């Protein structure tokens, strides 16, 4: 038994989301059977959305019941969810889980999809600004040295930061991205012996798939 | 609307400890057919949730009896005796008797570890960013335990509330530490109106706040 959500990641405020859940291992014509949809914002809780039964009965989260429509394709093992007039609030990962009833010993969400992702935003595709962070204008050396790199204002996600093209992989912290308005921003720290730098050059390599950009920044001193 | 409120919200445990998790509903959740649909789910990073307990005290087939769930009416508990690394993750309790169906905000089962001070680095704005309008001051606080920390930004001695942007890493699987970056984003103009910038960190590993500073004209 498996489920797989598909659909458009990224819509703009007010557009219509149509989500598909392809399942297998069960059949929606089986007495008691049903699927529902559950979505979860980044670093947040699960919110249940709507549920559809084998006898075509339906049930909606009442605080949204209106912008929601749930439907099945019994023959083709599929379940669809439509959300009209979306907004940034609908930004989340959407799962479909199975849940059968009648018999209370099967009545739960045993199987979930891998989850698909939606971002609702009206920001336009935007490439990062990359800034090399070299240490205090004139500091005390040293033992260890920590270099940094700031990736500012871009959309959508993700970017990928590597240090010296992937060679330097240890001593690296790359922090989750956060929103400054419309635009995401993240940073990476890296740490190395003060014998290995500046004598040997370290470089920050941001790559932004969506906007088709690649950017290198060498961390020169001062 | 039944509100499920879980406790604690974070729970540091040593591998092989016991761990409890309380979950209380905003109102009675015994369906009219007599069944109490209380369920526990566990979610690991990047996974979907997966079912541990259903009907309050029933283990779902495939779940080690070192997991057990108790409760009645409006008050429920999950107990894990002898915690395992594969049990680390986020725990949600759920009620399925009332519409809408609802889960808790979830509890983070994390690893306990000897305390450790952060390694703090402050970074002046790059002439790059300055040339082009803005001045962000970055601060990294790296590899500390416990997870709980507080950062203050200080310009010329004065606390600075607005324009701070924080991001914390999730717990490290190798060294069990946490890290975070804090970023003060200014206008070049504003930035030039002051000289000294301080990055301040209070953390249980010290009575005296850890401080990293620099002067703008040096």
């Amino acid at each position: 038994v498996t489920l797989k959500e598909s659909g458009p990641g990224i819509l703009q405020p007010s557009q219509t989301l149509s989500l598909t859940c392809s399942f297998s291992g069960f059949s929606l014509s089986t007495n008691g059977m049903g699927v529902s949809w559950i979505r979860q914002p980044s670093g947040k809780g699960l919110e249940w959305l709507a549920h559809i039964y084998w006898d075509e009965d339906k049930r909606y989260n009442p605080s949204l019941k209106s912008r929601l429509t749930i439907s099945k394709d019994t023959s083709n093992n599929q379940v669809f969810l439509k959300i009209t007039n979306v907004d940034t609030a609908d930004t989340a990962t959407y799962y479909c889980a199975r849940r059968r009833i009648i018999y209370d010993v099967e009545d739960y969400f045993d199987y979930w999809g891998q989850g698909t992702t939606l971002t609702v935003s009206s920001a336009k595709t935007t490439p990062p600004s990359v800034y090399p962070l070299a240490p205090g204008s004139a500091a005390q050396t040293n033992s260890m040295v920590t270099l940094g790199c700031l990736v500012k204002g871009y959309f959508p996600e993700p970017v990928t930061v590597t240090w010296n093209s992937g060679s330097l992989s240890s001593g690296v912290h790359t922090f989750p991205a956060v929103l400054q308005s419309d635009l995401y921003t993240l940073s990476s720290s890296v740490t190395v012996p003060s014998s290995t730098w500046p004598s040997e050059t370290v470089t920050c390599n941001v790559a932004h798939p969506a906007s088709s950009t690649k950017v290198d920044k060498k961390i020169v001193p001062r | 609307d039944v509100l499920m409120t879980q406790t604690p919200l974070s729970l540091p445990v040593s591998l092989g400890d016991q761990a409890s998790i309380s979950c209380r509903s905003s109102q009675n959740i015994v369906h009219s057919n007599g069944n109490t649909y209380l369920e526990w789910y566990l979610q690991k990073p990047g996974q979907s949730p997966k079912l541990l307990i259903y009907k309050v005290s029933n283990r779902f087939s495939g779940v080690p009896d070192r997991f057990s769930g108790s409760g009645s009416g409006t008050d429920f508990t999950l107990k894990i005796s002898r915690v395992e690394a594969e049990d680390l993750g986020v725990y949600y309790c759920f009620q399925g008797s009332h519409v809408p169906l609802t889960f808790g905000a979830g509890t983070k089962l994390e690893l306990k570890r000897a305390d450790a001070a952060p390694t703090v680095s402050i970074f002046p704005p790059s002439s790059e960013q300055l040339t082009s309008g803005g001045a962000s001051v970055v601060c990294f606080l790296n590899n500390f335990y416990p997870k709980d920390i507080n950062v203050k930004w200080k310009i010329d001695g004065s606390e600075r509330q607005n324009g701070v942007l924080n991001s914390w890493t999730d717990q490290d699987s190798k060294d069990s530490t946490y890290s975070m970056s804090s970023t003060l984003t200014l206008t070049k103009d504003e930035y030039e109106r002051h000289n000294s910038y301080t990055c301040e960190a209070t953390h249980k590993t010290s009575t005296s706040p850890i401080v990293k500073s620099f002067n703008r004209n040096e």
Partner: peptide
């Protein structure tokens, strides 16, 4: 109302 269970 309640969620339908049978």
């Amino acid at each position: 109302a309640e969620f339908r269970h049978d």
